[PDB]
């Protein structure tokens, strides 16, 4: 108080911060408190069940909040917010059971080393759950819908084997504003919801995380907005690591906001997700370990960019991220379904085998980009052409092999343009080829070898197949 004295907090919304405790602004008087099987019910409409504030080292077992009065939640004897906790480092909640209406449990600020084990938190049904407005939450969380567990301001409670039911948002977690401190830790959550109603399971704001999936979960009914994860403004240095087993049924994995990918698949057991689920937004995946697929399928007519693309029955639609996707899952080939797959800006092609009845087209004067060594093969495609730009722009100094066994038309441009001091081998097999020069370079000498085996080629350049910036190692024509 102003005079210097202290008054017990009676304000319902108040919770002490670590700062408050350091400022002398707050002094906790909560120690040596132990709870075993306490059952707490409230009249409908009561704001908060339990305020676990300043309870460092305090413990709980079988704390049970809320009554399953009946089907209508508006008249059920449970609180809007089950539990609100802060300044409780080292506290332990064993087998906590909460029946809530708006928010299950909220953990804010200092809770270092605190654990919540085998919690069973559930909204009493999901009826109108999507309309509940979170009461205690981080500023970055502006969506409407009930939230089973909310965590922010640097709280890093360990969640072990929680069972979360009937929630719009299973977990909403924000890292500390200043440095993204506060790891989101959930080990094997058992997530379920009637009629598959759900918005997100893990809504992560400015944070890192380590989550192990237990083969249990789902994503909501909205074909566009609902996803297991939503990564909002997670920093470039953050990582949201996913381990374990994906749900049996198809789900949409991730959506987000922000300029940095942070999701990591760490030996994640994908089950049949490639065939029945969706990645959602590939942009947010940072890296993949121990998850491989042989082929990436593209369908410019019937594809869907929400798909993983690694299963033939669920191809993606555009070429934008094909290099990224092949790098992530180590794909050995790309299959182009019938139709023209097109780009309007410079796009990287992975060094793999391209096959299928589709065609590749570079429009708006764009070029396909080769940024890695290896062999790029176009086999039996309906052709590849550009509307004016060079077909392949090489920006790697590593050995590049280009193997075209389909029709090739670069018009007045080159099939290959080396932007560096390159090392390229190009080989055209049958079909046809057209270009002003097969291989060229922007400057300082590029070594190349060439084989052109087709009668349908620009015969006028047989004697001079490459520009002056390219020196030939071999030339097999005629």
Ligand X SMILES: OC[C@H]1O[C@@H](O[C@H]2[C@H](O)[C@@H](O)[C@@H](O)O[C@@H]2CO)[C@H](O)[C@@H](O)[C@H]1O
How far apart CA 98 and CA 63 sit, in angstroms, is 8
Q: Could you tell me if 361 and 343 are in contact, meaning their C-beta atoms sit under 8 angstroms apart?
A: yes
Question: Which residue from 9, 68, 214, 382 is in contact with its own copies, where contact means CB under 8 A?
Answer: 214
Contacts (CB under 8 A) with its own copies, residues 125-154: none
How far apart CA 180 and CA 204 sit, in angstroms, is 11
Contacts (CB under 6 A) with ligand X, residues 263-322: 286-288, 292, 294
Comparing CB distances to ligand X, the nearer of 88 and 295 is: 295
Nearest-CA neighbor of 432 among 365, 373, 384, 360?
Answer: 384
Question: Which residue from 130, 177, 340, 398 is in contact with its own copies, where contact means CB under 8 A?
Answer: 398
Nearest-CA neighbor of 149 among 129, 131, 167, 133?
Answer: 167
Contacts (CB under 8 A) with its own copies, residues 73-102: 89-90, 92
Minimal distance, residue 250 CB to ligand X, in Å? 21
How far apart CA 259 and CA 325 sit, in angstroms, is 18
Comparing CB distances to ligand X, the nearer of 251 and 296 is: 296
Contacted by 261, from ligand X, its own copies, none: CB < 5 to 8 Å by type = ligand X
- In the 8-state DSSP scheme, what is residue 294? S
Q: Mask of contacts with its own copies, 344-363, x by CB under 8 A?
A: ---------x----------
Q: Could you tell me if 365 and 387 are in contact, meaning their C-beta atoms sit under 8 angstroms apart?
A: yes
Token pair listed for 341: 């797959």
Comparing CB distances to its own copies, the nearer of 344 and 471 is: 471
Count CB neighbours of 212 within 10 A.
16
Contacts (CB under 6 A) with ligand X, residues 320-359: 324, 327-328
Count CB neighbours of 462 within 10 A.
12
Contacted by 338, from its own copies, ligand X, none: CB < 5 to 8 Å by type = none
The region of 4-12, 64-72, 398-406, 458-466 touching its own copies under the rule CB under 8 A is 398-406
How far apart CA 27 and CA 18 sit, in angstroms, is 10
Minimal distance, residue 387 CB to its own copies, in Å? 28
Contacted by 328, from ligand X, its own copies, none: CB < 5 to 8 Å by type = ligand X
How far apart CA 470 and CA 457 sit, in angstroms, is 20
Q: Mask of contacts with ligand X, 224-263, x by CB under 6 A?
A: -------------------------------------x--
Contacted by 201, from its own copies, ligand X, none: CB < 5 to 8 Å by type = none
Q: Could you tell me if 296 and 322 are in contact, meaning their C-beta atoms sit under 8 angstroms apart?
A: yes
By CB under 8 A, residue 115 contacts its own copies: yes
Question: Which residue from 44, 112, 258, 383 is in contact with its own copies, where contact means CB under 8 A?
Answer: 112
Question: Which residue from 215, 312, 357, 468 is in contact with its own copies, where contact means CB under 8 A?
Answer: 215
Comparing CB distances to ligand X, the nearer of 287 and 340 is: 287
- 3-class secondary-structure state, position 164: strand
CA atoms within 13 A on the CB side of 44: 9
Contacts (CB under 8 A) with its own copies, residues 232-291: 237-239, 241, 243-245, 248, 264, 266-267, 269-272, 287, 289-290
Q: What is the DSSP string of 9-53?
A: ---SS----HHHHHHTS------S-EEES-EE---TT-SEEEEEE
Sheet with 353-355: strands ordered across: 295-298, 333-336, 353-355, 374-379, 399-405, 423-429, 446-453, 470-477
Minimal distance, residue 224 CB to ligand X, in Å? 24
Q: How many residues bind ligand X (CB under 6 A)?
A: 9
Comparing CB distances to ligand X, the nearer of 76 and 263 is: 263
Question: Which residue from 60, 150, 180, 407 is in contact with its own copies, where contact means CB under 8 A?
Answer: 180
Contacted by 272, from ligand X, its own copies, none: CB < 5 to 8 Å by type = its own copies
By CB under 8 A, residue 161 contacts its own copies: yes
How far apart CA 23 and CA 340 sit, in angstroms, is 66
Minimal distance, residue 328 CB to ligand X, in Å? 5
Minimal distance, residue 4 CB to its own copies, in Å? 27
Comparing CB distances to its own copies, the nearer of 71 and 445 is: 445
Is 98 exposed, middle or buried (CB count within 10 Å of its CB: 0-12, 13-18, 19+)? buried
Non-local (6+) Cβ contacts of 17 within 8 A are 26, 86, 87, 108, 109, 110, 153
Minimal distance, residue 225 CB to ligand X, in Å? 24
By CB under 8 A, residue 397 contacts its own copies: yes
Comparing CB distances to ligand X, the nearer of 279 and 408 is: 279
How far apart CA 440 and CA 463 sit, in angstroms, is 15
Comparing CB distances to its own copies, the nearer of 175 and 256 is: 175
How far apart CA 246 and CA 276 sit, in angstroms, is 12
Contacted by 170, from its own copies, ligand X, none: CB < 5 to 8 Å by type = none
Contacts (CB under 8 A) with its own copies, residues 48-77: 57
Question: Using CB under 6 A as the criterion, which residues of the chain lie in contact with ligand X when the complex forms?
Answer: 261, 286-288, 292, 294, 324, 327-328
């Amino acid at each position: 108080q102003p005079d210097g004295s202290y008054k017990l907090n009676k304000d319902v919304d108040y919770y002490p911060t670590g700062l408050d405790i350091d400022n002398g602004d707050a002094i906790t008087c909560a120690r040596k408190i132990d709870i075993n099987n306490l059952n707490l019910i409230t009249a409908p409409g009561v704001k908060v069940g339990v305020k676990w504030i300043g309870g460092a080292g305090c413990t709980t077992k079988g704390l049970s909040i809320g009554e399953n009065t009946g089907s209508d939640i508006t008249t059920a004897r449970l609180p809007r917010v089950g539990l609100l906790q802060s300044a409780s480092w080292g506290s332990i909640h064993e087998n906590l059971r909460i029946l809530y209406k708006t928010q299950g449990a909220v953990f804010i600020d200092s809770n270092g080393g605190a654990a919540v084990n085998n919690a069973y938190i559930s909204r009493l049904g999901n009826t109108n759950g999507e309309l509940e407005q979170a009461v205690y939450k981080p500023a970055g969380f502006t969506e409407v819908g009930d939230v089973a567990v909310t965590q922010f301001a640097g709280s890093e409670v360990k969640f072990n084997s929680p069972i979360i039911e009937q929630a719009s948002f299973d977990f909403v977690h924000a890292g500390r504003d200043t440095d993204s401190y506060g790891l989101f830790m959930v080990d094997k959550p058992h997530i379920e919801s009637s009629g598959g109603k759900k918005k997100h399971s893990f809504y992560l704001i400015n944070t890192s995380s380590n989550v192990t999936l237990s083969g249990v979960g789902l994503s909501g009914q909205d074909p566009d907005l609902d996803s297991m994860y939503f990564l909002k403004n997670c920093p470039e240095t953050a990582r949201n690591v996913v381990r374990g087993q994906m749900p049996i049924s198809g789900v949409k994995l991730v959506r987000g906001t922000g300029n940095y990918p942070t999701l990591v698949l760490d030996c994640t057991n994908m089950g049949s997700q490639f065939q029945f689920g969706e990645v959602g937004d590939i942009f947010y995946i940072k890296d993949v370990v121990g998850v491989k697929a042989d082929t990436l399928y593209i369908d410019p007519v019937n594809g869907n960019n929400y798909n993983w693309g690694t299963n033939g029955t669920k191809p993606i639609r555009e070429l934008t991220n094909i290099a990224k996707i092949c790098q992530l899952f180590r794909c050995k080939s790309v299959y182009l379904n019938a139709g023209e797959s097109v780009i309007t800006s410079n796009t990287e092609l992975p060094m793999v085998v391209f096959e299928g009845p589709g065609s590749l087209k570079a429009n708006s004067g764009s070029s396909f980009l080769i940024k890695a060594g290896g062999t790029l093969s176009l086999i039996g495609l309906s052709g590849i052409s550009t509307d004016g730009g060079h077909m392949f722009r090489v920006s790697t100094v590593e050995k590049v092999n280009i193997h075209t066994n389909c029709s090739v038309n670069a018009g007045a441009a080159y099939v290959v343009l080396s932007e560096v001091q390159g090392n390229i081998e190009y080989r055209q097999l049958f079909y046809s080829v057209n270009c002003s020069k097969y291989i060229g370079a922007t400057a300082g000498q590029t070594i190349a070898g060439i084989m052109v085996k087709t009668a349908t080629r620009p015969t006028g350049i047989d004697a001079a197949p490459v520009d002056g910036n390219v020196s030939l190692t071999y030339k097999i024509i005629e």
